[PDB]
Design a protein around this nucleic acid. Structure first.
Ligand SMILES: [Zn+2]
Lengths: 57, 108, 59
RNA sequence: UCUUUCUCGAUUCCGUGGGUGGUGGUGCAUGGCCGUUGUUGGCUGGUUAAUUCCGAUGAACG
């Protein structure tokens, strides 16, 4: 039952999925500190901002 | 044209304006704070080497193409003393601090 | 500062120190509402000593 | 901690040492400092039976 430390999933080129060719494939955080680059996590039911932690469903 | 870019990237390191890495480069691009971009010509995966000038043209940002990335990386300060030599494929200079005039007239 | 200096051999970087010496809400109400039988010695009696004897040469 | 990605970016993290070790425990020398082997003076507040309670608020002589 030894506690193994968590290891981050090193995904190849995490940046290369929010754009085309131009536009934003993910929407933008509408907050004050967040926007114009703070991209929106889109899980299968829900939406996440990684800085200010807004909960959008 | 490389020697006229080395001094402006050096003063970018002095004033900490440049953003190393693709994601920080894009974050400088879409915030409309960017001034110029530098792209390495040795890019094996092709879908991002075409995206950077697409974003630069969408935000009206000038671009310079350099053949090497590890040489570009050691110019932009990704090495310590040099034992470890790692390089970057793209870097955006957000703001500057003589040859910068040469670069900006080379853009025109 | 000082008076005795480099004089030779390749200063690399330019030693920025100017930032060190001279240095010296709807979500609020939202989270406010969110607030409320054998052992090693006995088994030796199991082993026999009468099966695989080498053939004996007599005198 | 186990899923699904968003962000911080060099503040890094993986392996092998019979090599040390340090927020370690422990004794000695070691510098400072206590205590140790007389005499005469000198009230905004609430609270209680009540100058009640809490609460702000010095000197010489041998
Ligand atoms: Zn946000």
């Amino acid at each position: 039952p030894k506690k193994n430390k968590h290891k981050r999933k090193k995904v190849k080129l995490a940046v290369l999925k929010y754009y085309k060719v131009i536009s934003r494939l993910r929407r933008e955080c509408p907050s004050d500190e967040c926007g114009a680059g703070v991209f929106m996590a889109s899980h299968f039911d829900r939406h996440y901002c990684g800085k200010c932690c807004l909960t959008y469903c | 044209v490389n020697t006229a870019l080395q001094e402006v990237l050096k003063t970018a390191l002095i004033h900490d304006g440049l953003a190393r890495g693709i994601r920080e480069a894009a974050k400088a691009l879409d915030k409309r704070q960017a001034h110029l971009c530098v792209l390495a010509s040795n890019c094996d995966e092709p879908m991002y080497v075409k995206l950077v000038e697409a974003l630069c043209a969408e935000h009206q940002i000038n671009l310079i193409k350099v053949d090497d990335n590890k040489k570009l990386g050691e110019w932009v300060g990704l090495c310590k003393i040099p034992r470890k030599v790692v390089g970057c494929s793209c870097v955006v200079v957000k703001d500057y601090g003589q040859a910068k005039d040469v670069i900006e007239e080379y853009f025109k | 500062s000082s008076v005795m200096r480099r004089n030779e051999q390749l200063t690399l970087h330019d030693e920025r120190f100017e930032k060190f010496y001279e240095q010296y809400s709807n979500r609020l109400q939202e989270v406010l509402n969110d607030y409320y039988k054998w052992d090693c010695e006995s088994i030796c009696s199991t082993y026999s000593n009468l099966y695989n004897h080498p053939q004996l040469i007599k005198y």
